[PDB]
């Protein structure tokens, strides 16, 4: 709870709500049409085809709002520099986990693991320490749209039995 600063606190609170509130709208819209909305059992196979592209495409709109959230940490880290102490930074990591849960139900990636796995590499003890995770978050988190964007491109590619798909 040790964290209030200026309007930065209330700013994150409102910006955080948009996270669940946005992705939630998807579930409401899905109600209109009879869709399984899941198929996360073990591993999914079909790539858009057969597998109601709703989930795949949705996985993009869901991470869309969350993505912006990650940047907040990076930008906030600069202004956070002040004070410092693992106590203040710890409050930043909390937001990640708290937000990592909602996205978990949907099924994005091994974020909860990737983010925690990075802690061993460079245990966030300074402002620069958080920057590492931030980059890892935005970079990987964005990968979610990469697969959906590349997979869907299968229609345009059609043939071409040689597409590494590496635009980054």
Contact 56, 74 (CB under 8 A): no
- Alpha carbon distance 93, 130 (integer Å): 8
Contact 45, 51 (CB under 8 A): yes
**92 within some domain:** yes
State the number of CA atoms in the 13 A half-sphere of 91 facing the CB. Answer: 17
- Alpha carbon distance 134, 142 (integer Å): 12
Contact 59, 103 (CB under 8 A): no
**35 within some domain:** yes
Residue in the structure block whose two tokens are 């990640």: 96
**1 within some domain:** no
**166 within some domain:** no
Asked whether the CA dihedral 137, 142, 144, 147 is positive or negative, the reply is negative
Experimental approach was: NMR
Identify the DSSP state of 83. Answer: T
CATH value at residue 119: 1.20.1420.40
Residue in the structure block whose two tokens are 């964005």: 142
Locate 159 and state its tokens: 């043939």
**165 within some domain:** no
**Domain containing residue 142:** 6-159
Phi-psi region of 37 (alpha: psi -120 to 50; beta: other; left: phi over 0): left
Locate 78 and state its tokens: 């600069």
Identify the DSSP state of 89. Answer: H
Residue in the structure block whose two tokens are 């200026």: 6
**118 within some domain:** yes
Structural domains of the chain, count:
1
Asked whether the CA dihedral 106, 110, 111, 112 is positive or negative, the reply is positive
């Amino acid at each position: 709870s040790a964290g209030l600063t200026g309007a930065t606190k209330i700013r994150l609170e409102r910006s955080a709500k948009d996270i669940t509130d946005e992705i939630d709208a998807i579930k409401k819209d899905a109600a209109l049409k009879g869709v399984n909305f899941d198929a996360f059992k073990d591993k999914k196979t079909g790539s858009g085809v057969s597998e109601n592209p709703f989930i795949l495409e949705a996985k993009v709109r869901a991470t869309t709002v969350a993505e912006k959230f990650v940047i907040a940490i990076e930008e906030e880290a600069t202004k956070l520099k002040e004070t410092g102490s693992s106590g203040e930074f710890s409050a930043m990591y909390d937001l990640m986990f708290e937000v990592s849960k909602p996205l978990q139900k949907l099924g994005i990636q091994e974020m909860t693991k990737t983010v925690s796995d990075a802690a061993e590499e460079n245990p966030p003890t300074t402002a620069q320490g958080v920057l590492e995770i931030a980059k890892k978050m935005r970079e990987k988190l964005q990968r979610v749209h990469t697969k959906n964007y590349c997979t869907l491109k299968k229609k345009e590619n059609s043939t071409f039995t040689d597409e590494k798909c590496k635009n980054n």
